[PDB]
């Protein structure tokens, strides 16, 4: 239920030839919840913990989406941090899985960023009216979203008609739980430069180049 009790659990699991937690450390979207759990003082706390996990050899230095996914699906790691989309691949494997609340850090919850999967029409396209037809009458329909969802789960769909079906799924409940504890990302043009600043900062601190104090300095600029 807490981030701070993972090192103990990892010691226990490493004795039996298993990892505790493996997730994508390269992409900052996955590390941000821990960083933003308290908050600055909050970012310094959250990241130092993440740095200590790699320093204590609990997590690998270059842990990416593929080796994390594969390891969990194989049955090598006890935990992973991922989205709705990742569930179908677990179902394919013979792993009795559960989706739950993200661990708390310094008592307070880990605040994951909330994304709204969205479809936009390219300004330089001649098929603008044909795409509108596809998006409205064929995709954003009960039947249409069902098709996408049975391949790889969408999460909490924007369609009003899908509320009953969403509410019947335990994994969706866990997703909504984390979404409430998190916050929706502003759409602003500066998001790109922000994400890059966090992507470098996390990689530098993970590998062992820049200090945790120096990471937030370069990132705030």
């Amino acid at each position: 239920k807490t981030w701070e009790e993972i090192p103990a659990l990892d010691k226990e699991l490493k004795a039996k030839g298993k990892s505790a937690l493996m997730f994508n450390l390269q992409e900052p979207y996955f590390t941000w919840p821990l960083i933003a759990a308290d908050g600055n003082a909050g970012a310094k706390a959250g990241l130092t913990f993440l740095v200590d996990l790699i320093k204590n050899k609990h997590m690998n230095a270059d842990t990416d989406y593929s080796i994390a996914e594969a390891a969990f699906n194989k049955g090598e790691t006890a935990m992973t941090i991922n989205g709705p989309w990742a569930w179908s691949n677990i179902d394919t494997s013979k792993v009795n899985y559960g989706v739950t609340v993200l661990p708390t850090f310094k008592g307070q919850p880990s605040k994951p960023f909330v994304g709204v999967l969205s479809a936009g029409i390219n300004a330089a396209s001649p098929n603008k009216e044909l795409a509108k037809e596809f998006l409205e009458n064929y995709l954003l329909t009960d039947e249409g979203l069902e098709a996408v969802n049975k391949d790889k789960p969408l999460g909490a769909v924007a369609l009003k008609s899908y509320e009953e079906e969403l509410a019947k799924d335990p994994r969706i409940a866990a997703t909504m739980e984390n979404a409430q504890k998190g916050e929706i990302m502003p759409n602003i043009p500066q998001m790109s430069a922000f994400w890059y600043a966090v992507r470098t900062a996390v990689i530098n601190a993970a590998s062992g180049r820049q200090t945790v104090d120096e990471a937030l300095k370069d990132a705030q600029t």
Partner: protein, 232 residues
Amino acid sequence: VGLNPNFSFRGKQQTRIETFSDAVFALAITLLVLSSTIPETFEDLWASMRDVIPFAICVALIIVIWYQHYIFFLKYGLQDKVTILLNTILLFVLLVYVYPLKFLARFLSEIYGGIFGIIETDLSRFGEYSHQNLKLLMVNYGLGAFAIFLVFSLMYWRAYKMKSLLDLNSYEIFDTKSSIIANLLMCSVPLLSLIITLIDPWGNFRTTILSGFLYFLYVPIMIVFGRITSKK
């Protein structure tokens, strides 16, 4: 058969905890009645039939607890250490309050018998009706009721804590949360009598009147506590 249409009953298969529990409930209601002496003469027979009103009240009370138990184990199908622990605490409280309930039920049946005018038999058999004894009456039975509902709240909270392990959906999560609130609200009324009695503001029977009067205003006082949390 079931309370909610959106709830997926995990405990349709009978388990040892439930079997054991059924034995205890059956034993409680059975020994309450059959702890009495066997009539040897017509006089004893008629005396023993005066006990049915007190027993009906006791039995009604025990099955109500049994029902809540049935619904909990039906909902979650739980069988872990902590559930076993809380379950034992529950049955323990039940058991220690079986004979005291027989007592209270007989006592109140005589008091209500006198009021309505059905009978006019003595209450000197029960001992002296003093302020200290009448206060301890509230505190005792009030502590009993509080505990039962307190334990039901803890049991539902244990299920809430294992929501993911149990694969609880949004409807089931909501039910569980509502069941915790319900049991805490139920527990609050005996907790409030008990506290009022233990402080004893008046230093006389007035204390006992108020403490006793909170049970008659169960429904309205429960609504006040529920309304306070929703208003904020």
